[PDB]
């Protein structure tokens with residue numbers, strides 16, 4: 351069995367190996383990468399996503415989200431308070447202001463310490479979930495706006511044609527902006543490219559151990575767990591590495607830098623935070639190996655998780671017994 355300790359693997363594809371996206375994902379899996387739940391892919395030196403980032407300031411962040419925490423430093427939830435629209439140039443200036451900027455630090459480990467000590471005492475503003483792309487149309491390799499769609503994958507594997515579309519999303523971050531513990535919708539893969547700026551630190555639980563994280567979460571967030579049998583779908587709960595270690599939960603960590611891709615694998619729980627002003631692009635995707643995870647994915651039906659148009663068909667075809675309850679949660 352490859353990668354039996356479920357370590358995060360780092361790949362350095364050549365320019366030739368960077369041509370065929372599906373083939374390379376399958377290669378990484380042949381080496382056991384999926385066992386970690388997360389892999390890093392460093393693009394060949396010949397590749398670029400676009401020529402420059404000099405002309406992005408006029409992108410609008412229609413609904414910046416202030417991420418307000420409740421709880422204790424290592425075990426907290428966050429809610430998202432909607433703020434007034436602002437441009438990416440305005441948001442960058444805000445990220446760099448004295449109130450929001452990254453503090454002085456020694457290295458990534460010192461910054462990580464500071465994050466977990468102090469995150470709850472601040473409310474950073476995240477420009478998350480913006481439909482769009484920063485890949486140049488002429489970038490042919492690993493262009494997250496040109497991937498095979500999940501609807502096409504389902505059709506190819508299962509024979510059923512379905513409605514829906516699959517487009518990327520931009521994330522503008524600042525120091526302390528946080529992504530809560532989650533798996534993807536329908537336990538899909540994700541791919542995330544850090545276009546520019548400061549790093550993003552990731553934490554991940556191996557897919558084979560995801561239920562250990564869920565059991566801890568039910569213990570640590572007992573009201574939320576009574577409310578919903580899949581409350582991690584709400585994407586609000588944070589648990590620190592220290593707390594995970596105290597509770598024996600297997601996990602790994604890694605820091606993504608600008609110019610690097612991360613892939614999350616089906617049912618790989620992940621969480622993390624941004625080091626300072628940055629911009630990432632991410633999209634969900636599927637492979638043949640995903641289908642069995644999609645059929646077994648948990649679902650939130652309490653109403654909170656509220657998701658895209660395109661999840662309807664996935665539930666309807668892969669999970670027909672759950673469909674009626676889930677759809678009630680959507681309405």
Ligand SMILES: O=C(O)CNC(=O)C(=O)O
Pocket residue numbers: 478521528529540541542614620630632633
């Ligand atoms: O970058 C973020 O805020 C969150 N990203 C993801 O969870 C992802 O790419 O799957």
Ligand SMILES: [Mg+2]
Pocket residue numbers: 405406407408409
């Ligand atoms: Mg612009």
Ligand code: NI
Pocket residue numbers: 532533534540614620
């Ligand atoms: Ni994710």
Ligand SMILES: [Zn+2]
Pocket residue numbers: 577578579580581583584650651652653654655
């Ligand atoms: Zn729910």
